[PDB]
Amino acid sequence: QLSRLHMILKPFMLRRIKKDVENELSDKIEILMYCQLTSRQKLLYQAL
């Protein structure tokens, strides 16, 4: 599938990708922070 789409797009569909050109920028430090819900949230979530 992929190769067909690539060849169809190539004559009209420029790309860059940040890491080729934004060489002077810092990379995004990306955090996922898990949180624990409260007593009031437990009561309602359970009732649902």
Place this chain on the structure above:
Amino acid sequence: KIEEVKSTTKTQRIASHSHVKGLGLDESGLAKQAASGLVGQENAREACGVIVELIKSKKMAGRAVLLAGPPGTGKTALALAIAQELGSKVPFCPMVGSEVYSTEIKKTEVLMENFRRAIGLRIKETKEVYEGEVTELTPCETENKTISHVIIGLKTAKGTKQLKLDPSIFESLQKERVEAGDVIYIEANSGAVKRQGRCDTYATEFDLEAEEYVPLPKGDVHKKKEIIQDVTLHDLDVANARPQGGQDILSMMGQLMKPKKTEITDKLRGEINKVVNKYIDQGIAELVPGVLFVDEVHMLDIECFTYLHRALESSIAPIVIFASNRGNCVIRGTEDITSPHGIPLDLLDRVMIIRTMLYTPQEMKQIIKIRAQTEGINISEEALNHLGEIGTKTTLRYSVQLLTPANLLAKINGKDSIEKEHVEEISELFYDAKSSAKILADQQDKY
């Protein structure tokens, strides 16, 4: 990319019946061998299965049951199971039989306070309130001088209104030191006032000030709302006998004085009964009779036993659970007369008795395993078998009591779990009630 978690609030303390979660009966009314934290005692658990229906029926008053059986058999564990089985909303009132000896009020009356506390009531109260920033405040004077009105202008995010109010409310606003620019709340049914602070609009007017500031109230200046209030008959009885509602000097000063208990008279309870029946008739109220649990019943005085003859024959009184662990003792207050469980025959004829009985070695092992995993500790099988033997030699209470001490030794010498050698060490540091009673009998010349 990076992942993080936070939670540091210390979890709830473990205690002597925190493993019990309910009776663990099946739908047919029979008892499962092990469920919801209980094991064994099938006839007594089946009997408690009848009593949780007797409570939820709402039909009855003054029915009473006695849990009886040797120390360490699980009487109060069952009564605590029933308190789980009824759920939170039915009032369950725990009491010990030595609490009747107050220094403020007669024993005969302390019982009545507890009975009236075990009947709950649920009320759909409607409150009407005014709230806003006070933009204007003006009294209107009249002749024999008097105050006829106060005029108050209030402001909220919706707009403004202006109200004419009784001098009682002006007296209250003065007392609360209210001024223009303050945000206030008034409930018109009670006549009560609360100051919240100055409106946020003014919060930058000074470099240095003592006040807290609040955002402008949302919604209409005047509104009425329903609050579902849970209460007991006792709470109505007492709040009328030494009042603190309203806003007069007398009630306001009665909030400062030392709160002595008092013998509420039969005329007040009579008038409160009529009021709550009229709240039920209007469909404003629902009644929820609950349970009174009187542990260690064997040491009420004979004056108190002879009062329960009358209180259990009331058409109002809630369902009562007594508990006792005594043989043919002398009845307190009589000095001469002995009877089963320490209770007079005349009262013992007005109760149904539930027999509770000693555990087998297999049951003790099972309870110890349940309890160890409740206290959060890991135990090896040969250790647990050793504790089982200690149980048969002593008492299951002592056998359970060694668990946490053993776990401390285990972590001190770097083991994750109780090994047999830990239990075998702890058993020699702490004596039990029989082994200590031996050494103290041998050396009886010296104590």
